[PDB]
Amino acid sequence: MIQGVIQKIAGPAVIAKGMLGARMYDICKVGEEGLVGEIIRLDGDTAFVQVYEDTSGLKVGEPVVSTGLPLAVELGPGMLNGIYDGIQRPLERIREKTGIYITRGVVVHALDREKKWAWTPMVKPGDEVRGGMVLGTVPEFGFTHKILVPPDVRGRVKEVKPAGEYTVEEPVVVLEDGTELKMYHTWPVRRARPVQRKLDPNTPFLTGMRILDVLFPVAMGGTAAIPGPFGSGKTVTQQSLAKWSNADVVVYVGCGERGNEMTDVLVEFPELTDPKTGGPLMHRTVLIANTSNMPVAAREASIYVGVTIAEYFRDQGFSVALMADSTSRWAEALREISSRLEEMPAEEGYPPYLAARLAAFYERAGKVITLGGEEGAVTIVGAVSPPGGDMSEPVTQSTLRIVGAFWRLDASLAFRRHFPAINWNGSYSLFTSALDPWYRENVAEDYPELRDAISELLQREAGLQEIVQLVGPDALQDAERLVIEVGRIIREDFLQQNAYHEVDAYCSMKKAYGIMKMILAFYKEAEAAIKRGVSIDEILQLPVLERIGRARYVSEEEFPAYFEEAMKEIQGAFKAL
Amino acid sequence: EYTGITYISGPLLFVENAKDLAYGAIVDIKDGTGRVRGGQVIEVSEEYAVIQVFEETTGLDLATTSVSLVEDVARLGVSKEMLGRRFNGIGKPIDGLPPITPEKRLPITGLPLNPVARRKPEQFIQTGISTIDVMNTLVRGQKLPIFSGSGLPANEIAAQIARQATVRPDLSGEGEKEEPFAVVFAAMGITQRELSYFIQEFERTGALSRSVLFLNKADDPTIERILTPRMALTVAEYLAFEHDYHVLVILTDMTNYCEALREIGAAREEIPGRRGYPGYMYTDLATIYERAGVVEGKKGSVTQIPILSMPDDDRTHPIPDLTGYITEGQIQLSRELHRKGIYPPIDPLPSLSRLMNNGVGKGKTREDHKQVSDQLYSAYANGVDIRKLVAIIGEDALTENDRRYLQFADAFERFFINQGQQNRSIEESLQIAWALLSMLPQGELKRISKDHIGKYY
Amino acid sequence: EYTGITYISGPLLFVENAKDLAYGAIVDIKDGTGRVRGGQVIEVSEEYAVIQVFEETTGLDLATTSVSLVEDVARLGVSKEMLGRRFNGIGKPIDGLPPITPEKRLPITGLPLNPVARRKPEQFIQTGISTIDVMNTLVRGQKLPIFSGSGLPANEIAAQIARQATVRPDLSGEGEKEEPFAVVFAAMGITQRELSYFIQEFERTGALSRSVLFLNKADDPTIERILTPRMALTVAEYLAFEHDYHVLVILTDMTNYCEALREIGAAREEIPGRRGYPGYMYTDLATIYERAGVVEGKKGSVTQIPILSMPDDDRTHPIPDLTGYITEGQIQLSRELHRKGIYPPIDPLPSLSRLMNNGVGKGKTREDHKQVSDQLYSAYANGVDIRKLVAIIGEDALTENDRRYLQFADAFERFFINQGQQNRSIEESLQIAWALLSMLPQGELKRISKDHIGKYY
Fold first, then answer.
1. CATH T-level topology, domain A115-181
2. Any chain B CB within 8 A of the CB of A355?
3. Do chain A and chain B touch with ≥3 beta carbon pairs under 8 Å?
4. Angle at the Cα of C367 (from C366 to C372), degrees rounded to 5?
5. CB C132: neighbour CB atoms within 10 A?
6. Helix (H) or strand (E) holding C158
7. What's phi and psi for B66, nearest 5 deg?
8. C117 with A100: Cβ contact below 8 A
9. Which residues form a coiled coil (chain A)?
10. Buried b / exposed e across A449-470, counting CB within 10 Å, b at 16+?
């Protein structure tokens, strides 16, 4: 449509006139080189354009051809098991057109449209569609993906192809009432699908890590954070999360990630194995991750993209598992862009518009019931990565109230090879309160009763180890001994796990529940031991302790039979003495 | 009417000339992308008047635009069936059920309150979380900020006192037709956690028969956060003074107020940094905490009960600092006792209760209410004090005139502070307070003398 | 001409008729002094441009303002004859060989590495040292910053390790012919002594016919500062990926790099950043470091080691923060160590390299290495706790274990950390570790298995 001419070139931002009556957000070809750009805030007959890539010899006054229609996010088949970036372009079609090192003026599509994707229909000619529920599905080998037509798109459908593999670009359907579609659908980048009711999580939390989910439930549609810098033992959580955790889909996303560490992940991604899918995790994982070896505005465009696509899955009754890594670092870009503008940094060294888009990011993500009446969950794990650990930086002291849980791992807790390494005095989840109803309701009746109660172990052990059992526990009271007797089972059973052994790292409700349970029934018998004056030599040598240990080396299969024998064994080993 | 725009921007923008644009007028703008917005016309020029953009910059064009004046200033209805109903959202309230008829359409800017049209308090609020309303003396003649702080929840505490405020004919000062079960809540900005928490709380408290809770819904645009406070307010000012009823504006976290507010101050180039958060803060807040007094020549009030958290467990940040100054004193909760299990944790160690003998008396509540006010305070205070100087010189420093003050802090601890969410009358509180004032020898006490000793044991 | 000269204050210049000019261009300016000077053309418009003169600003006159167009496109040679030369600055004759060799006129920034074309570390390098190759393996394409102080000579401790460094992938089954030792060095803002002390090391023993210098003197203009890296950057791509060679980029003094940058950006209308250092740093700093990491099918890739200065290694300004997100690990310098003349000075618990076992395995750097690498971390760190406390704990309590841990330390800093300018390999740097631990009993060895002990003690 429109055609304009450049006026200023202020580094990567550009200012160009000839663009009037424009539509905000465009694919845009800046110059004849074809630097990928976006028309943003106009003023008069000229505008501010934020051009993702750099210049190196672009003249002033050249022709600028641009779409003149709003850029929307494109969604269709090839989204699952396709490599993408936060600009909504596929990273693999880039590599193929740029080689080893990115070149300027190379642009690609927005979907995997060169591939002929499987199809089977779910509507038939002369029937009307209902938006926000269904259209027809793509059976992908990797993971099932229901390509549905967005809400408020009503009216008859005509000519629906049967089974066969069909390109994205080729029709598989058409609409009778006009505004014929193919298999690709367009949704505005910052518009969110409306809902029928708000909902609250009640889907049990399991991430495959003991203390991680059993002490702190945050549930599906909670919002978490992992503070401190990423790497140096922190990777444990992130990796294992999407392997075990109850989500149907996984979304990974970067925005200023590391070098070699950001590639270790990609490469080991298909060799991470899901049990439902039974092979490659990459099958039900969508990639849109961005590193700083990608354009300026890469990291600034990042969020909204990923957010939208997650809502797609949500709509089909699929729970997603988003990981908004390097939140701190997102803003790098925003700041840079805003310097060059009137929207200058004015907070505490970062934008005051930082505050708006950080907040809103969490207010669009949860468990809810969509317009088609399907329920998904849009769980975020917040790797912020501040430079000290400080709270006087914007990013932290904002997240801190907005998102209700903080999951600090300590370096010491990590180094001994007992996972998770979660430092409890430095973690919290304000979610737990309102979930206590829904926990006991669906999971198990005495489940809450175990967690809250048992945590007192760590508290009277933290200030006990210090320098009060410096002289050995044998020179202390029999009530202060009791704490390390139970202490054995909590530290060799209910906190020891391996990311090297896959028969112990697979955990679920029923396994973790009995483990925490036994340590209640062993305190109830420990404390009856010291009330009878039973020696602390023979209680530390019971077969009972060993009976716990063999039942963390089976995933959940041998667990039921081992709980039959293991429980009653406690019962007759304090009664055998 | 004005066709054409010469600036597409997100918080404020150009509208050529002006000849009938009022200050703070309602305009309607068809963006030509099929969307429609409004806003206030704050700042009017014959050069470039700038209008309050109500949503993000996307979804704007110059192909079709129009600016058109709808009303002189902001206005909105106040039903007399507003009480006993929750009206979530603003403009068109989505409380998920139909809106109530705007019976009396009046302004929602604010109606000021003459300083000579005020009278000294005489009402008490009997609330079921004993500890506060005993010592601090919760009256309507104070507006003390409740500071939650980091890793202390703002919701749970606010949630509590919702159903737990009760009314008596004369154990509350004033009558029970002068105090309804109605209350009002005004959000300064609710967040993820704050909303996902109050969901369950509406169906349990009775937000359909005793509570009004205006919200921002946590997902409406930023400028909405500088609309809902004063809008929520004015509503209640009417049924309170003119219709006669006591209602308490139970605020929420002023952090998100700053948040939204700040972006206007860097897009108009004001003073948006006092120490990292606005220098112009207080100016807009003049109106919020102006009606938080007690009217003279009418009956029934409005009192702001600020409830606000802190970005750090230190106050070096403007967030609680500028609020301290504005308003009067502080009540806190801290995390001293929270780490051990106590709920509700209440620490009024650095507190200041401005009034505590006004708005109560003797016979307006109880006889020993006026006396046992300061007593508990310093009895308890000097408990925690000991644990300080013992450890300084070896591990003891205690005397026999210490062993009694020591245990006065245990006695005040889990017996009085901890209570669950169990409603407690002003009777049950003060009555039994005097048997916990039987841990130190009675008769000559610090603030009490022999006049309630032989009457209350 | 190219007149329109306004604000020539210092090395700024505005000129009209910049409709013939481009961003990313460089042009000859003419004047009647007879000086022909460059300077990049930034912030361009159809009228006013910003040019920043190559050398000074003394000579610009009003008579002649003409500009002989050199080239709008950015010209930059890709060289292949530069693998054993010497140059200072941009590329000027020191050894009397010509600046560069043309193949192409590639731009200065072509845009960094595509991430799906990057593979995992799977090889390692050896810098002739013990502690930073045994305890922490410097791997393939690793980005490892060396945080140095101020008042300490950064520069010497750098080039010291120059000659020591000769790679040893011997133990894996690869030569130093499939891993050549190519030192490509780009500093800026270096002292007159230090700039000659650098070339001294090289010319000593044979290592200058396999390496290229570039080093922009502290008296060579702040404009040339910036481009210095970008030059050899673009040449480097063509060295290690397309010749299959292995380069090691060693930058020094980042403070100068970042100061000069600021001046440039401040005229393009970009506001400087926290503690004055720029906020548009991030982007620009990325582009130098992200040409590091291995590449699929191309064995040779560049290893990045940047070196920067801080007052005491404090993290209270941008220079570390920024860096510390894209780069992995940090290796700070100890005052104790450097006093006593233990070189290079690497801290105990304060120091760690984020990757150290995913570029090496067992039998690639020896099998026992695995658990030896996490012994000497916990084993060294224990002596640092009584490395001054032997008369602060008096002679009224003294134990055998901790005493022996003082003697461990003295021999650990002498023999293990420092090893002079004498060369070492993996196998000789391993010897030292075992020997010292031999004083210590089996009962104080706990981080190494009996299997490894049954190999070497």
1. OB fold (Dihydrolipoamide Acetyltransferase, E2P) (2.40.50)
2. yes
3. yes
4. 90
5. 22
6. helix C154-164
7. -150, 150
8. yes
9. none
10. ebbeebeebbeebeebeeeebe
Q: What residues of chain C, 383 to 442, have a C-beta less than 8 Å from chain A?
A: none
Show residues of chain B in contact with A401, CB under 8 Å: 150, 154, 191, 193, 253, 255, 309, 311
CA-based nearest residue in chain A for residue B13: A43
Compute CA distances C228 → A548, C60, C282, C288, whole Å. 64, 25, 18, 11
Nearest alpha-carbon partner for A147 in A72, A74, A220, A253 = A74
Containing C403, the helix (H) or strand (E) segment is helix C400-411
Following DSSP, what letter does each residue of C196-259 receive, concatenated?
HHHHHHHHHSS-SSSEE--EEETTS-HHHHHHHHHHHHHHHHHHHTTS---EEEEEE-HHHHHH
Resolution of the structure in the document, Å? 9.5
Report how far apart, in Å, the C-alpha atoms of C41 and of each of B394, C73, C270, C281 are.
73, 11, 16, 19
Q: Which of B52, B3, B31, B39 is nearest to A22 (CA)?
A: B31
Q: Which residues make beta-bridge pairs with B12?
A: B52
Give Cα separations from A445 to A210, A212, A439, A451, A513 (angstroms): 19, 20, 8, 12, 11
**Structure obtained using:** cryo-EM
Distance CA B232, CA B90 (A): 9
Residue C404, H or E segment: helix C400-411
Distance CA C239, CA C243 (A): 5
In terms of Cα–Cα distance, which of B278, B193, B263, B277 is closest to B225? B263
CA–CA separation, C354 and C362 (whole Å): 19
Contact yes or no for C113 and A326 at CB 8 A: no
| Domain range summary for chain A, segments of one domain joined by + | 1-71, 72-114+182-429, 115-181, 430-577
- Domains annotated for chain C, with CATH where assigned, are 1-457 (3.40.50.12240)
Q: Which residues have a Cβ under 8 Å from the Cβ of C339 and sit 6 or more positions away?
A: none
The two tokens of residue B154 are 């703002």
What residues of chain B, 261 to 320, have a C-beta less than 8 Å from chain A?
A: 262-263, 265-267, 272-273, 276, 309, 311-312, 317
Whether residue B192 and residue A404 make contact (CB cut-off 8 A), yes or no, is yes
Q: State the sign of the Cα–Cα–Cα–Cα dihedral A498, A502, A507, A512.
A: negative
- Cβ atoms C101, C238 nearer than 8 A: no
CB C322 within 8 A of CB C280: no
Q: Which two tokens stand for residue A401?
A: 């109230």
DSSP for A242-300? HHHSS-S-EEEB-SSB-STHHHHHHHHSTTSB-TTT-SBGGGGEEE---BTTS-TTHHH
- Contacts with B, A 215-254, CB within 8 Å: 223
- The CATH number assigned to the domain with range A430-577 reads 1.10.1140.10
> Contact B193/A431, CB-based, under 8 Å?
yes
Angle at which helix C400-411 crosses helix C375-383, to 10 degrees, equals 110
Contact C169, C179 (CB under 8 A): yes
| Residue B162 DSSP label | T
HSE (side-chain half, CA atoms, 13 Å) at A179: 8
Measured in angstroms, the CA of C48 and the nearest CA of chain A are apart by: 9
The Cα–Cα gap between C380 and C385 comes to 10
Alpha carbon of B385 to those of A25, A191, B335: distances in Å? Answer: 63, 57, 17
Residue type, C185: F
Question: Strand ranges (DSSP E) for B58-178?
Answer: 66-71, 75-78, 104-107, 126-127, 146-147, 165-166
Name the CATH superfamily housing domain A72-114+182-429: P-loop containing nucleotide triphosphate hydrolases (3.40.50.300)
Q: CA-to-CA distance for A255 and A300, rounded, in angstroms? A: 8
Sheet containing A367-370: give its strands across. A195-197, A367-370, A375-379, A320-321
Positive or negative CA dihedral for C448, C452, C454, C456? negative
